[PDB]
């Protein structure tokens, strides 16, 4: 229940494949629910493709909460997780 | 015989190993949060990579 | 009378001397006694291994048991051109031996620490496990993927 | 005959070497002079002129070393006693317990000859200040910790166990277990809740450490 | 760092004492392997250099004239011959180290991986292509171990 | 033992008579063959079961082939003992198994 503060963070600084897939799914679901996007569609209508473009421009407004087995967690913004 | 035995060892080992996943502290644990490997393979390396 | 044992351990079906493609004439026995062979004179107990995992466990311990499991599986799929990464075998040995004893992948073995009555039912023996859980009033959480 | 006697003297010499090693790596004052004892010297010292191997005057006292006592402050001296009767009875077990109580020995090793009486399991677990490790001479002809298939088990102190359970943010129940009466656990005199560090070696991942807790 | 079992530094005389083995030891071995490979390449270059009569600067030099280049006395012939045979640039070494470190970092198991299920399938899918009956090469005539 | 009565040809048995005499008394018939200082003995031979040599290996009596094993970067093996089994369906072809003679590495080339 106690958040590990941003200054120290034990878990990997890289986005995992599962984190990428879940972020894309969540953002695509939000877009499919008419959420505003922060990228240039250039004619794109697919929420998944728009979410992929957002992830490419590193503009998805979500943060990954990685719970440790000991019950704690640390937050990693999508932008600060590197691919 | 192989067709008849397909899906038996995989199913049994699956029932055994379904819930073992890598944790964010690099430990392999059961779904009861009990440690099976403090590090995967004693190396932490994915065989796929 | 002509069936009693006067010499040799009463656990060996037969002993055979083999050659490991060298000048070394090892003997490997088709028996069920490992401690007796190790404590037999003229044999090195430092390097004397059986292929019975449960025998290794009873004689040498759980760590040697998991080593024996890993090596036996690696030998079994190394004789068939089965290129499986050894980490999968290591994980199998660890999951089989992490409770302190060699627990198999059978219905009795699965009742190790899981307590997941629904997972156990979906595996095998649904009704007996369900009735045991209802009678003991088990309170298994929902954590398994099953 | 003579073949039985010579095999018996060699076997007793080997078992004596094994218990010396077990006490030495449990952490006690035993060095290579009384570990590496040749069979001829065993005959010279612990074998009567008659030749029949006696198992009373090689029972010895083991004291903790400075390093062992510093790591584990609570560890008394050790009394390793060898039985002579194939089937041990209540009387000799009672006199062994009396010896333990009267000499204030934190533990006592009882290496019997052939078998142990059924009544022992009611009688041995009654010693508050101490404990008794019950052994068989054939079960320790060869010490298993010298086997190529047994990784080096290192028992951890209470401070080390606390440090491990904190570095991993763990409870004891989440640890992998090693059984009471496990062949290596008995060799090391492990107790419930005592964590052992296992140094195992792998071909594709090198040397790495795992941990087990005695239950 | 390789702390103790109690969390203290190791005295650099017990660094590999084998009760201070922990995690990060595979990483240490990997770094040592990288150094060993680079040292093999450097030793090959040095052996070629000294086989040409000129100095094989395997060890760093330490003298008053250590500033001057030790290839001035060479008459422009074996210099270009050695550069023809082995020419290891600093950019090349740095690129190799970057690639190797990147690959090792990428090879680490990712959290959340269903590693147990992956291992189960990796051990069981090979178990479908193997015969239940034990088939042996014609002429082995060894003990029929399954 | 395996002795039979001359009268009824039933099997003879040793019976303890008076003064502990071991006679060859016949059940089912009044026949008595006593032992007056005579040694009735049955001797049957048994096999010697001699020593056996080292097992070794008869791999020279196996079918090699001309194939380079995947572990050609460790050992230069161009031969492999083989046997072919059609563990595939009748529509599929046959599968071949191999074992390098230079390292002992087995693999199925299908
Ligand atoms: Mg087909
Ligand atoms: Zn008759
Ligand atoms: Zn080969």
SSE succession of chain A: HHEE
What is the assembly state of the chains in this entry?
A: part of a larger assembly
The biggest beta sheet of chain B reads:
3 strands, antiparallel
Order of helices and strands of chain B: HHEEE
Distance between the termini of chain A: 28 Å
As for the CATH topology of chain A, it is: Eukaryotic RPB6 RNA polymerase subunit
Structural class of chain B: alpha+beta
Can you tell me the CATH architecture of chain A? Alpha-Beta Complex
Dominant shape of chain A: elongated
Give the strand order of the largest sheet of chain B, numbering strands 1, 2, ... along the chain: 1-2-3
**What shape does the CA trace of chain B take?**
elongated
| Strand order in the largest sheet of chain A | 1-2
Helix tally of chain B equals 2
* Helix run count of chain A: 2
Radius of gyration of chain A, Cα only, in angstroms? 14 Å
Beta-strand percentage range of chain B: 5-15%
PDB class: transcription
Keywords: targeted DNA integration, Ty1 retrotransposon, Ty1 integrase, RNA 19 polymerase III, transcription
Entry title: Structure of yeast RNA Polymerase III-Ty1 integrase complex at 2.6 A (focus subunit AC40).
Chain A: DNA-directed RNA polymerases I, II, and III subunit RPABC2
């Amino acid at each position: 229940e106690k958040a590990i503060p941003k200054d120290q963070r034990a878990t990997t600084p890289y986005m995992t494949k599962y984190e990428r897939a879940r972020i894309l799914g969540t953002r695509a679901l939000q877009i499919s629910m008419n959420a505003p996007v922060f990228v240039d569609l250039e004619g794109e209508t697919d929420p998944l493709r728009i979410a992929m473009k957002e992830l490419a421009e590193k503009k998805i407004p979500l943060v990954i909460r990685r719970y440790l087995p000991d019950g704690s967690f640390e937050d990693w913004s999508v932008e600060e997780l590197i691919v | 015989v192989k067709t008849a035995e397909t899906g038996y060892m995989s199913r049994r080992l699956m029932k055994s190993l379904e819930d073992l996943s890598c944790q964010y502290d690099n430990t392999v644990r059961t779904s009861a949060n009990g440690i099976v490997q403090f590090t995967y393979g004693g190396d932490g390396l994915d065989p796929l990579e | 009378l002509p069936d009693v044992v006067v010499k040799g351990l009463p656990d060996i079906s037969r002993a055979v001397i083999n050659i490991r493609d060298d000048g070394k004439r090892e003997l490997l026995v088709e028996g069920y006694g490992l401690r007796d062979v190790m404590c037999t004179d003229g044999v090195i107990g430092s390097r004397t291994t059986t292929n019975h995992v449960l025998e290794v466990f009873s004689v040498l311990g759980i760590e040697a048991a998991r080593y024996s499991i890993i090596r036996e599986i690696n030998y079994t799929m190394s004789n068939h051109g089965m290129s499986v990464d050894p980490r999968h075998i290591q994980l199998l040995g660890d999951v089989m031996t992490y409770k302190g004893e060699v627990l198999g992948i059978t219905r009795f073995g699965l009742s190790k620490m899981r307590d997941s009555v629904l997972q156990l039912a979906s595996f095998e023996k649904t009704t007996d496990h369900l009735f045991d859980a209802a009678f003991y009033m088990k309170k298994d959480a929902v954590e398994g993927v099953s | 005959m003579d073949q039985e006697n010579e095999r018996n003297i060699s076997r007793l010499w080997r078992a004596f070497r094994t218990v010396k090693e077990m006490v030495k790596d449990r952490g006690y004052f035993i060095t290579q002079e009384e570990v590496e004892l040749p069979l001829e010297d065993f005959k010279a010292k612990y074998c009567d002129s008659m030749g029949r191997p006696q198992r009373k005057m090689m029972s010895f006292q083991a004291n903790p070393t400075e390093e062992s006592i510093s790591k584990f402050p609570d560890m008394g001296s050790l009394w390793v006693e060898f039985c002579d009767e194939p089937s041990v009875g209540v009387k000799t077990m009672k006199t062994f317990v009396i010896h333990i109580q009267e000499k204030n020995f934190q533990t006592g090793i009882f290496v019997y000859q052939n078998n142990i009486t059924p009544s022992a399991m009611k009688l041995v677990p009654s010693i508050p200040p101490a404990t008794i490790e019950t052994f068989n001479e054939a079960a320790l002809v060869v010490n298993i910790t010298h086997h190529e298939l047994v990784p080096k088990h290192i028992r951890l102190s209470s401070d080390e166990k606390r440090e491990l359970l904190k570095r991993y943010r763990l409870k004891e129940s989440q640890l992998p277990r090693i059984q009471r009466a496990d062949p290596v656990a008995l060799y090391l005199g492990l107790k419930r809740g005592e964590v052992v560090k296992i140094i195992r070696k792998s071909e594709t991942s090198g040397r790495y450490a795992s941990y087990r807790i005695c239950m | 760092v390789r702390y103790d079992n109690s969390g203290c530094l190791v005295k650099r005389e017990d660094l590999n004492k084998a009760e201070y083995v922990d995690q990060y030891d595979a990483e240490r071995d990997f770094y040592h392997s990288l150094r060993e490979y680079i040292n093999g390449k450097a030793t090959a270059l040095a052996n070629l250099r000294k086989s040409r009569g000129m100095l094989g600067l395997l060890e760093p030099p330490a003298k008053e004239l250590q500033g001057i280049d030790p290839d001035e006395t060479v008459p422009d012939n074996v210099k270009t011959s050695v550069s023809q045979l082995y020419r290891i640039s600093e950019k090349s070494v740095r690129k190799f180290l970057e690639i190797a470190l990147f690959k090792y970092r990428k090879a680490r198991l990712e959290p959340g991986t269903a590693i147990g299920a992956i291992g189960a399938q990796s051990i069981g899918e090979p178990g479908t292509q193997m015969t239940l009956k034990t088939f042996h090469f014609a002429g082995v005539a060894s003990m029929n171990v399954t | 033992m395996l002795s039979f009565c001359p009268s009824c040809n039933n099997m003879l048995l040793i019976t303890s008579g008076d003064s502990g005499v071991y006679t060859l008394a016949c059940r089912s018939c009044p026949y008595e063959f006593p032992i007056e200082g005579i040694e009735i003995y049955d001797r049957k031979k048994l096999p010697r079961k001699e020593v056996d040599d080292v097992l070794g290996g008869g791999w020279d009596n196996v079918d090699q082939t001309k194939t380079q094993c995947p572990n050609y970067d460790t050992c230069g093996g161009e031969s492999a003992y083989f046997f072919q089994l059609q563990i595939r369906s009748a529509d599929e072809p046959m599968t071949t198994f191999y074992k390098c003679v230079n390292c002992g590495h087995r693999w199925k080339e299908n």
